[PDB]
Amino acid sequence: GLKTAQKTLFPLRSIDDVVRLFAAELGREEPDLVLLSLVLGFVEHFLAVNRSPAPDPPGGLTYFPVADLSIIAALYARFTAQIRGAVDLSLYPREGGVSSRELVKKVSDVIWNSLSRSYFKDRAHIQSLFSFITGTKLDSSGVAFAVVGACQALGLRDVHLALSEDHAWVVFGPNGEQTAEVTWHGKGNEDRRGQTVNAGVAERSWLYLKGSYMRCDRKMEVAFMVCAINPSIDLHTDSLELLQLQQKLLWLLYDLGHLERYPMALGNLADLEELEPTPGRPDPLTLYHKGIASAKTYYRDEHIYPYIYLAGYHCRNRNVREALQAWADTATVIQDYNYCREDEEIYKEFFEVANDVIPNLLKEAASLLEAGEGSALQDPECFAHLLRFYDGICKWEEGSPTPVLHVGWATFLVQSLGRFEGQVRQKVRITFQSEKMKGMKELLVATKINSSAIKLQLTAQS
Amino acid sequence: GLKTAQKTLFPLRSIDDVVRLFAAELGREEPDLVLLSLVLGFVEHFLAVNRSPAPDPPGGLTYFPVADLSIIAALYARFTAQIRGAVDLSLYPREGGVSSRELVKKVSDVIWNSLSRSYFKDRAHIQSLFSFITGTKLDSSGVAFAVVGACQALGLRDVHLALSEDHAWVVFGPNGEQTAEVTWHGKGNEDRRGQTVNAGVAERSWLYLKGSYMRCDRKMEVAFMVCAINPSIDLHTDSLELLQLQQKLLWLLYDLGHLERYPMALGNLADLEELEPTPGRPDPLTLYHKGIASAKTYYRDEHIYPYIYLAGYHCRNRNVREALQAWADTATVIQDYNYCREDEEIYKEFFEVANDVIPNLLKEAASLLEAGEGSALQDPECFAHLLRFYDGICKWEEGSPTPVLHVGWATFLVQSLGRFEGQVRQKVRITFQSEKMKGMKELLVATKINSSAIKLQLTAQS
Ligand SMILES: CCN(C(=O)c1cc(F)ccc1Oc1cncnc1N1CC2(CCN(C[C@H]3CC[C@H](NS(=O)(=O)CC)CC3)CC2)C1)C(C)C
Ligand SMILES: CCN(C(=O)c1cc(F)ccc1Oc1cncnc1N1CC2(CCN(C[C@H]3CC[C@H](NS(=O)(=O)CC)CC3)CC2)C1)C(C)C
Incomplete structure (x- = not known):
């Protein structure tokens, strides 16, 4: 009643x-x-x-x-x-x-x-x-x-x-x-x-x-x-109408404090604001950062999506360095998990980042670098973000009941490595946490990239 | 531009x-x-x-x-x-x-x-x-x-x-x-x-x-x-949408002072508020009375529609006394006009009130009175408002280049008079402004209504 x-x-x-x-x-x-x-x-x-x-x-x-x-x-x-x-x-x-x-x-x-x-x-x-x-x-x-x-x-x-x-x-x-x-x-x-x-x-x-x-x-x-x-x-x-309804309802909840402990709702609101900004409201980037702050404050920084939302935004806005740093930060959260048999949705996100989004981002960067012959591709720190992403994935896989890395990942890793000149890769400053990346450190910086050796080492089960 | x-x-x-x-x-x-x-x-x-x-x-x-x-x-x-x-x-x-x-x-x-x-x-x-x-x-x-x-x-x-x-x-x-x-x-x-x-x-x-x-x-x-x-x-x-748009725009204008000198806009807003009341706003009656006040203040009380708006509301809400008082007030404005050859629209309104609206209102009152066998039909002031309405119509006609009254008006006058008992009609002490009503003052209050004498007087030239 x-x-x-x-x-x-x-x-x-x-x-x-x-x-x-x-x-x-x-x-x-x-x-x-x-x-x-x-x-x-x-x-x-x-x-x-x-x-x-x-x-x-x-x-x-x-x-x-x-x-x-x-x-x-x-x-x-x-x-x-x-x-x-x-x-x-x-x-x-x-x-x-x-x-x-x-x-x-x-x-x-x-x-x-x-x-x-x-x-x-x-x-x-x-x-x-x-x-x-x-x-x-x-x-x-x-x-x-x-x-x-x-x-x-x-x-x-x-x-x-x-x-x-x-x-x-x-x-x-x-x-x-x-x-x-x-x-x-x-x-x-x-x-x-x-x-x-x-x-x-x-x-x-x-x-x-x-x-x-x-x-x-x-x-x-x-x-x-x-x-x-x-x-x-x-x-x-x-439906534009349902997007507008969701957008207006999320702003109502936001104003009343009810999204403070809800990182994904903040990322959802940021995505809607990117589609159609609301006059007088924080910009998407501010909202993605609030999502991460929420995960840090209430959830021990153990959530993955806050970083994925941010990295996605940087990708769409061709912020190559910031996108790679955010994907690196994503991998730094996942590495303290074990990949279990009901975790496939987050595997699908990392698969799409490694094997599609990062390759397309570095391709766009290669095109920018060509036009007017400092690029992310000439930056050792940007290369270090790429390696930190893979290191997190390898550390996630360690001790897990299900494998993560397959030969298809190795193909894209070799393509992504090759976007950076040997002399740039050889200047990288990183400490690896994963056994696989520790083992591969010479291959990752070699002037001539050895695809067969990278495939063997990345996909090892041993 | x-x-x-x-x-x-x-x-x-x-x-x-x-x-x-x-x-x-x-x-x-x-x-x-x-x-x-x-x-x-x-x-x-x-x-x-x-x-x-x-x-x-x-x-x-x-x-x-x-x-x-x-x-x-x-x-x-x-x-x-x-x-x-x-x-x-x-x-x-x-x-x-x-x-x-x-x-x-x-x-x-x-x-x-x-x-x-x-x-x-x-x-x-x-x-x-x-x-x-x-x-x-x-x-x-x-x-x-x-x-x-x-x-x-x-x-x-x-x-x-x-x-x-x-x-x-x-x-x-x-x-x-x-x-x-x-x-x-x-x-x-x-x-x-x-x-x-x-x-x-x-x-x-x-x-x-x-x-x-x-x-x-x-x-x-x-x-x-x-x-x-x-x-x-x-x-x-x-269109509900266009009613809501008109209603919200009239409230905007109202708040900014732009309906102060606009009686018909205030009547329009009263009618919309009756259909769909706006929480926290004045009621229709307050708005109709504001329209009349506007006409009195800025237009020498020489407007007809402010009173028609009010009369209409009282008619729809079966407030018989207040409806008749408002129609009496409408006739009190028209009596100081001459009926001219392009005044058809207001002739149609008076004709419809005399020969349809008042008859239906008094009939509804007669049905209510029958069911309790006090009524507006037992109220001398209601009878006096009916007479003042006709008196204003007769005075409007005086000196007009177009005649107003004819035999088509007589049957409804006689029927409306007859809704009030002789003992009720005989309580009023009024002086008419029109020659036509003065010339039948005794007939209007006589116990037995002489329909043919009232018809001859109502239809007399001038
Ligand atoms: C979306 C439907 N949904 C859930 O999936 C859900 C169900 C649960 F039981 C528990 C959690 C749930 O997830 C959410 C809960 N509350 C809010 N949002 C939820 N979402 C949003 C969610 C994560 C992010 N994605 C969009 C991302 C995908 C990756 C993308 N990056 S990229 O690869 O494109 C890089 C360019 C950025 C946007 C949509 C689905 C899951 C809920 C809302 C019913
Ligand atoms: C409404 C359209 N209109 C005009 O008709 C207009 C044109 C002119 F050149 C000069 C004046 C005009 O009239 C108005 C001007 N500004 C605002 N409103 C105007 N109206 C409202 C108007 C008078 C009242 N009537 C409504 C009455 C009719 C009788 C009714 N009685 S009832 O309740 O028993 C039946 C529902 C009460 C409300 C509607 C038409 C004329 C204007 C606004 C363009």
Whole structure:
């Protein structure tokens, strides 16, 4: 049952009306996760899922799907009735505002058992409670979010969303010290629903961030649903309206302090600001730096994406030195992880940096150097950043249950090395931490680069 | 030839961006009438002229046509180049910032000779310079507005819009003391273009308001184009977007003091607030009473529509006593006019009030009274307001070159009288101003209503 103060801000007829609803909910101690997620999913459904005067507006039309109270109230009542109907709190000895693992598992099972048996896990627009209620489809992290929403609907104030950079689960109990898996991760992995994350933290996988993962409060859970907005209409086109809505909502959260402990939300906001800068706001670079400051302050500098967001920006702006330094800093965080079997998404990022982005950046630099025959390619410190990147990757691989380096990496390493003259490479000042790079130090600086020797040494398993 | 400060808040992506452009222009000594009218006309053209999840948005969509600088700048340059191209200011000596009548007539003829030869004069969405430039079509008052816009584009600071409650012309020269007709009025009337309004003022027609017409400054000309917004998509549906735009622009004008001397704009704003109240704003009644205060203060209480706006609100809200008092007040203004051959629009309003609106209001009161077998029909003051309404109509007729009353008015008078019992009618002690009502004062209050005697008196000559 929606309170009177919630009803008076319907109907929603614009992006600013949505922003106003978020503003009002975020002024409460319990922003209503179910109401806000239903609204975002409704809007995304109709802007993305179900997508002499000029004969059509010459600058295009933008659209907004009117959200009537009668529609949103009906979806809300359906969700709350399903959860309250399925969970008898009197059956769950819950001593002093701490939920039991058995109660968290019950709520989790109610969400899980409601889902359609068959759908693609990478399907777009199945993140929201709108998708849950109207299509019985949720994506992996959508299940975790829906468990937290369901727990809020039951008054279980201790159940919160936990987030790594690629996975979601719940924290509960006194001080949020208990953990439970509530959803799947990846494809064809062992079912760990119900389990703690203690094994994941101990194994030093990126997926569990060595325990430096996000423990959300209710306001951060609102920030999560805003980052979860998916503007994609199809493979090659985005809803401008959903980008603008996400941008405005992230600025609201920013102003209220709710992105302070949310590095990826700051990087998301920086990316939107690069697309369309907001008058009077910090520039993207300031926001990427705030993301890194957040990771340093709250997460022991154990996050990878803050550095990837920054390096990406420098790449797009042809800041060759700064991009290489940021990719070096990325590798310096990953080297203190072990590459585990559910870490593939961050492997994909390092693969793309090593084998595509760095080669294209150094190629652009080679073209600049040619035109008017000081370049990053003539700078030993820039070469040192390239080597520090590879050193971090090699150190990440050490002690890991899955290999990282393959002969394909060696091809790109040889191409990247060859962008720097022998006399520049021979001036490099570096101490390596990885056995592989220590072993390869003569090959990396040789005037004539030996591709066969670099391939053998980079890909050794020994 | 747009200034840099104007370009920076394109593109316009929302209703609030349009409001921000109006706010910026209204902070200048010469708000740019051509830019503002082009923007409103562009937005109106694309929002009204050219316009388990539900399969279609269940509350519909709202739209906004993005207004790019390149589109609006192109239309602006077309207008300014056409006017500056066609009018050689070197041929019209102009000491002391007073335009000559021949200069005003030239600019008027340039607008007039640009128009399409054949189009419906009451066509919707041909009020703006957008319509003029892209369709060579303007409605009656649109021509007057475009003459003023063209004079501003030529730097003629003394040329202003004049409007009555049913007509527009221009005022110019020292103190706006010169007048020129620049457009047509009504259908099948003799053309007065190039003439002063002196004959209209002297005849005491409603059309020229006995000289108590609006003499706009540039800020009031902005208020005019905002009132001119036409949200109608077709006979039975309005653009919510254009209603919201008009409402927000009228509140901007209100806050800046620009509706102080604009009774009809205050009535328009009251009507919009009744449809969709703005949190924290005065209620409709406060606004209707501000409109009447404006008419009393600045226009000698010689305007009709302020009272019609109030009467209309009370009618819609079934406030029978207050509606009749407001119609009585409307008749008390008209009685000091002469009914002239181009006053048809206000004749239609009085005819409809006498022969439809008051009959329906008294019938509804009679139904309420029947169901409780106190009523407005038991209130002598309600009867006195009905008599004052007819008394003002009869006094309006006196000395008029067009008769007002005829046998078509008699049956409704007799029926309205008969809604009040003899004992109620016999409590009033009033002295009539009209010869016609004086000549049946006993008949109006007699226990038995003599319908044929009242008809003979109401239809008597003069
Ligand atoms: C994006 C969807 N999403 C998650 O993937 C997610 C799910 C979880 F359970 C836990 C974490 C999750 O990630 C995020 C959570 N909160 C906010 N943002 C999240 N994102 C943004 C994310 C990382 C960055 N990338 C964009 C990068 C990709 C690499 C790119 N560098 S480059 O290779 O192009 C160099 C030029 C820069 C932009 C998008 C996806 C993951 C959430 C928001 C539902
Ligand atoms: C509205 C269009 N318009 C004019 O008609 C106009 C043109 C002129 F040359 C000179 C005056 C003009 O009138 C206005 C000027 N400025 C603002 N508003 C003008 N209006 C509003 C206007 C009078 C009132 N009526 C509305 C009444 C009609 C009766 C109604 N009674 S009811 O409630 O029982 C039925 C809903 C109450 C509201 C609409 C048209 C004329 C201008 C703005 C271009």
